[PDB]
Structures are given as structure tokens and as C-alpha cells.
Amino acid sequence: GDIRDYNDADMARLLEQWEKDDDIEEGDLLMMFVTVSGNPTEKETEEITSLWQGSLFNANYDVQRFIVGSDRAIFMLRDGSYAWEIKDFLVSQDRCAEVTLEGQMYPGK
């Protein structure tokens, strides 16, 4: 055990907002968790996510990214067309990033 506390609690609270916004859009009251470092050293996630920003937001993708807990960087996709494309980019890396979807995953049933 270590850091998972922010994962469970803080991701729940963070995504709950996105849920409620999507609900507000529903008119009544894909996203990815990427384990990159697995190490609390924010510096790693800083460098790497910096690259990811300069890459993804350069080709203009309907996505947003939050860097909390160097274990996992979170990426919310409003468009899932390039989902496996961004994922591919993350796994295409030297150290390779570990990608998992929010809630449920279509692969790995």
C-alpha cells in the first residue's frame, strides 16, 4: 500500500465531477489512468507529461490532462477515435506507460 489512497479517493472525486458535467449535459442531476512512473517523484511525470502535452495538444486533440500523483497521469478524452492512437504512443515509449480505462475496459474482459 502507498499512493493508492489518492487513486481511489481523489480520482473518484475528480471523475465524479466529469460524471456530473456529462449528467448536466444529459439535462438532469473514454478516460484513461496512465501508470507512468509508479514513483512519487513528480519530476518524472513532469518531464514525460510535458512531452505528451507538446505531442497531443500539438496535433489538436479534444483531450484534457491532469498531473496528480506521479504514479498515474490522468487523461480525459472527449473523442475516442484516437484512443488507441494516444495509447499506442504511450506504450511506444522507451520505459513504456501502462494505460487503463476509467470504470470498465473493453479489452481484457
UniProtKB/Swiss-Prot annotation:
Expressed in many tissues, but not in skeletal muscles. In the retina expressed in retinal ganglion cells, inner and outer plexiform layers, photoreceptor inner and outer segments and retinal pigment epithelium (at protein level). It comes from the Eukaryota. It is found in: Endoplasmic reticulum. Disruption phenotype: Disruption of embryonic polarity and mesoderm differentiation, likely resulting from a primary defect in Wnt signaling. Residues 81-109 are annotated as: Escort domain. Monomer. Interacts with LRP5; the interaction prevents LRP5 from forming aggregates and chaperones LRP6 to the plasma membrane. Interacts with LRP6; the interaction prevents LRP6 from forming aggregates and chaperones LRP6 to the plasma membrane. Interacts with LRP4; the interaction promotes glycosylation of LRP4 and its cell-surface expression. The chaperone domain provides a folding template for proper folding of the beta-propeller (BP) domains of LRP5/6. The escort domain ensures LRP5/6 safe-trafficking from the ER to the Golgi by preventing premature ligand-binding. Chaperone specifically assisting the folding of beta-propeller/EGF modules within the family of low-density lipoprotein receptors (LDLRs). Acts as a modulator of the Wnt pathway through chaperoning the coreceptors of the canonical Wnt pathway, LRP5 and LRP6, to the plasma membrane. Essential for specification of embryonic polarity and mesoderm induction. Plays an essential role in neuromuscular junction (NMJ) formation by promoting cell-surface expression of LRP4. May regulate phagocytosis of apoptotic retinal pigment epithelium (RPE) cells. Belongs to the MESD family. This is LRP chaperone MESD. The chain holds residues 45 to 184 of 224 of the full protein.
